[PDB]
Amino acid sequence: ILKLSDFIGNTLIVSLTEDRILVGSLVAVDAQMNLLLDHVEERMGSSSRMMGLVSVPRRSVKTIMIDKPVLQELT
Amino acid sequence: PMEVDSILGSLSITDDFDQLVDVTSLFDELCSKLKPEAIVKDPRFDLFEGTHSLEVNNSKLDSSLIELTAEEIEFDVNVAYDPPLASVAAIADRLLRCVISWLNDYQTLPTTVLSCRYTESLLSSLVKGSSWCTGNILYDKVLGSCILGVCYLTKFVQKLLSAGIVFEEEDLNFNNMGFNTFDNLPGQDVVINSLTESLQILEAYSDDSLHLTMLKHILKIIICLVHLEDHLTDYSTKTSHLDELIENANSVNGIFPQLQLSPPKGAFSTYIQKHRSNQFPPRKITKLPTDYSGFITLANDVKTILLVDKAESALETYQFAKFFNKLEQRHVIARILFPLFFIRDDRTVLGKFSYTQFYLLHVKEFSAQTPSGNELIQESSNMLLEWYQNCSQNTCRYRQGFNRQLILWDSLQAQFESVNSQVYCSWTYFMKLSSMIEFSLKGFDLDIYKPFEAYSMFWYVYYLSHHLETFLKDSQNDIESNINAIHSMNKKLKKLKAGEKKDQLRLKYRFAMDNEMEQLQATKQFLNYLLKEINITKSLCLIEVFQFAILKSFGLIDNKNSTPSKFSNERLIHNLRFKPFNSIGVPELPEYEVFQQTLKDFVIEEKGAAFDIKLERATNFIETEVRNVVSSIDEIMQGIKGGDNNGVLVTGTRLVQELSLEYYCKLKHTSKALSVNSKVIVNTLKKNIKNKDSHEYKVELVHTTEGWNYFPIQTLRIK
Amino acid sequence: MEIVYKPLDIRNEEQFASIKKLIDADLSEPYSIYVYRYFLNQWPELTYIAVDNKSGTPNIPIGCIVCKMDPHRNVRLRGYIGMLAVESTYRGHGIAKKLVEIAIDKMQREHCDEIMLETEVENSAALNLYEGMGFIRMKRMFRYYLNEGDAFKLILPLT
Ligand SMILES: [Cl-]
Ligand SMILES: [Cl-]
Ligand SMILES: [Cl-]
């Protein structure tokens, strides 16, 4: 069985509404699925850049993905 | 979009992770079970850290959504835009005015120097180990040298900020967006040679145009800015490059109206905020200065810094610190430069004295007594150096620096007191009490105090000034006692006939004259100046207190908030205002009841003819004391002009003679304005009592434009 | 107009979003969702809203105040006023003053020793509102609001 508490501190892949994708460590999540991510890397096509601490609202998140080996480690 | 690398790059995004699983569904189920108030987070993590977070799809918090024009998006450094000379000159011009906007106008580095695509290009190649090839000599060689000069400048500013002299992101912004050039950026000799070589290319041009003259002056200006590091690396006091910077800035200003400049579109943009790693919200580019006058201000402020090297006494440095940054806030580069130029690498002051020698010089000139590595002296010397460094802070941090000093001076004085070292205890007391007074009056310049608080602060400073004058008067009496003791020896010698005991007295007397007399006279005349200055401060505070008491006598102001509220009381508000002085033992902070009783003795509670007679005594004092203050200021101004060798006053203002005169001139203006305003108030209020439909007035603390705003004018104004 | 001042309901999600819209309109530089979550989730009892009961939209917030409190030094509780916003159509009716009064009253009943806020030195209306309640300026911060100028640190002592 799983909880959100198991996920915090682990890198997540969050594709946004646009072609941009965010890779960051999950810091906090609230009841409305607003996420706060640290050490965020913004990937758009060829380009990549760091953006630090970013919060992503509900409407902005297209999908949430985690690495397979990391996911099994949390359990 | 259509570009090849962005297309193929989409497949490479997931390459780093071998296997990814979608967990969007699991996240929504769990979040639904959470109570609305709940947040899932690490227990150690504090939610205050998230208060400085970005937010996607928020225009004001998302730099990825910055709107750029086609020229801004497609700008290429390798294209030689036409016309080349005019475009290169326009590029260099805007970059220099970006330098001014950054340092003079306190704009951010990403929106000024880093907004240029050429500086970004050079810094990016420099990180690895001009960075663009256009095939045109103006872009590749001349403009490349310009960018290198400015990039050398910002690197030097980084070294200045590393010393921790001033406060980051307040006096000077240095968000360089993760740029670290290591040792790859060339040394000063290479940069100056590169700029000189571009100058010779411009000499070769047979045709002479205004744009060409512009570029020649810009190039020489950049050379001067690169030479600013000479004042720290070699502690040079030479003003040649600083004078050239002024001349070239003046020549460019006359050229500005004659021609029109247009940099290539997209040369300066917010592009770097959108694509380079950025942890901050996007910011628009602020309007740039229209001329090069900011370089003139920078050059003269730095020239003023180098003057302190000519100091020959502790009093000359002390008065330099009191005045060099006092009339108006100096350029931030000059304000960083002064403590680094004053307190040098080899742990010496100006390369002349050690820290303890410098401290003992202050005690000697104030007390006229020889000492005849102590921990108390080591701490006192560090305390004194921090006092000098606080002088070059901005106008707000300057007052805040005294918060730390007052309790440290007090503790230091009490520690000297416990070991019965009364000479150092005396000098520490002078510095503490002078700092208490300076800290309090500085609040009026910053408009910290509301009009109803004006009596409390002005009377407290009068109270402090009275104790300082009493202390100084006793100090000067001790000096005179020592002077008369030497004089009495000479009187006794004349009575004595030739004998062996007369040889002893002549021996004692000659040593005193050779080793003690000259310093006693200098200290006596120095204390004479301090007594005149503190009596001016004392009189001005009293004049303000009388003015307040006249206003309250007519019912126009009170020493508390006019509209009461349920939440607080006047005693708590009074104690909060005087909290900084609460832990100082000598002089004791007067109790709340003493503040109230003192005001009652000033306020005229009588009515009618009895009121009129007491009011006349108060107004006559203001007018009479203002004229006496003007006479005292005039005497000080004569002494400043005459110098320190005229036998009456010693002011030590040789290095800041013009600035100290300008200060007392402003002080004289305020004094006259206080008297004029007292007459206006009395004439207005006598007419107002007569009329039943009297006006409703409020009191405002008004700054005199050419005055000294430690003593604002308490002005009536119709509501 | 029939203005009603009530504490925040943390369970109401629409009430939450309405507060964000009000505060964001006034700000030159905005706050993230987690700025609001830092205040409202940890000090829900220190955020108040104003609603017009006789308006067409009765329960929509037309004004709000957001506050926190923490120990300062070790011995004193410092209340803090983070945000104050009043809708443009409802300005000039003393609504902001009533929101400050009800928030300070709550923080005083929570044994705050003092209330602290920052404001622009050029914000005459804010200075007049706070200093009229007993606040005094304790500090001036150089270019605290960047090109909008310096700030004053205002403190109202309660104990
Ligand atoms: Cl441009
Ligand atoms: Cl000692
Ligand atoms: Cl008082």
Numbering used by the authors:
A (entry chain C): 3 to 77
B (entry chain B): 0 to 128, 133 to 375, 382 to 728
C (entry chain A): 1 to 159
Reported in the publication:
The transfer of an acetyl group from acetyl-coenzyme A to the free α-amino group on the N-terminus of substrate proteins is catalyzed by N-terminal acetyltransferases (NATs), and is considered to be irreversible, as no Nt-deacetylase has been identified so far. NatC acetylates protein N-termini starting with methionine, followed by a hydrophobic or amphipathic amino acid, with amino acids at positions 3 and 4 also contributing to NatC recognition. NatC forms a heterotrimeric complex, containing the catalytic subunit Naa30, the small auxiliary subunit Naa38 and the large auxiliary subunit Naa35. The large auxiliary subunit Naa35 acts as the central assembly hub of the NatC complex, forming extensive interactions with Naa30 and Naa38.
Structures of the selenomethionine-derivatized (NatC, apo) and native, CoA-bound (NatC•CoA) complex were determined to 2.40 and 2.45 Å resolution, respectively. Both crystallized in space group P212121. The derivatized structures were solved by single-wavelength anomalous diffraction (SAD) and refined to Rwork and Rfree values of 19.5% and 22.3%, respectively. With an RMSD of 0.218 Å, binding of CoA induced only minor structural changes in the catalytic subunit compared to the apo structure. In the peptide-free NatC structures, Leu27 in the α1–α2 loop is positioned in a pocket in between helices α1 and α2. Naa30-Asn147 forms a hydrogen bond with Naa35-Gln106 in the apo and CoA/yArl3-bound NatC structures, but traversed a distance of 8.8 Å in the Gag-bound structure to form an intramolecular hydrogen bond with Naa30-Glu120.
